Amino acid sequence: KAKTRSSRAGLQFPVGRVHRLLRKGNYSERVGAGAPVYLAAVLEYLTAEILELAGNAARDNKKTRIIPRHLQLAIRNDEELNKLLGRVTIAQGGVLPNIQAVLLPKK
Amino acid sequence: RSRKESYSVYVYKVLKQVHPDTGISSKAMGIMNSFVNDIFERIAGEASRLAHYNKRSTITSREIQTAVRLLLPGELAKHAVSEGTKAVTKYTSAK
């Protein structure tokens, strides 16, 4: 008889949990029916976007298992994710290869 | 021996939709948890403020959408807004 709010909404992300986290979080007295559906969709989208580009990066390094390095490359190689995570440290991510042109040898 | 919740199960489903042959390390998964929790707090946060600014008791789909417009850059917003409008559409049409 029971069908997860997630399965109704078309989502892998847990609509139920997101609703409870919005309650136990003192954001507002009350929580509209849709608010946790939307929020769960946004978190799933952004998770897809990052796992997409991380996947690509992982493949390129001849690899089938995403690691932090792959997350850091996907994010710091995307104008938009890089802005959204401009003030964020991905542990064990390193940095992008970047040598200032003037530091290259002459011949 | 008590329950320590995470988003791992969901991150792993979305991974398999997006890269069916691809795995993910324990450390990577820890980074994706931090991610979801962060964007959760940022969005809920701005929603809360929006609701408080308009003297409202209630955070609806609309406060979540405005929040997402304020917090996500250019094309990320536009795609997030449609994925979110879509999921709400699909849920409102479910007997």
Partner: peptide, 14 residues
């Protein structure tokens, strides 16, 4: 009909 990324790939079908 699931999630559509900026690249233009989708999340399979049903």
């Amino acid at each position: 009909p699931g999630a559509r990324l900026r690249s233009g790939r989708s999340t399979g079908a049903p």
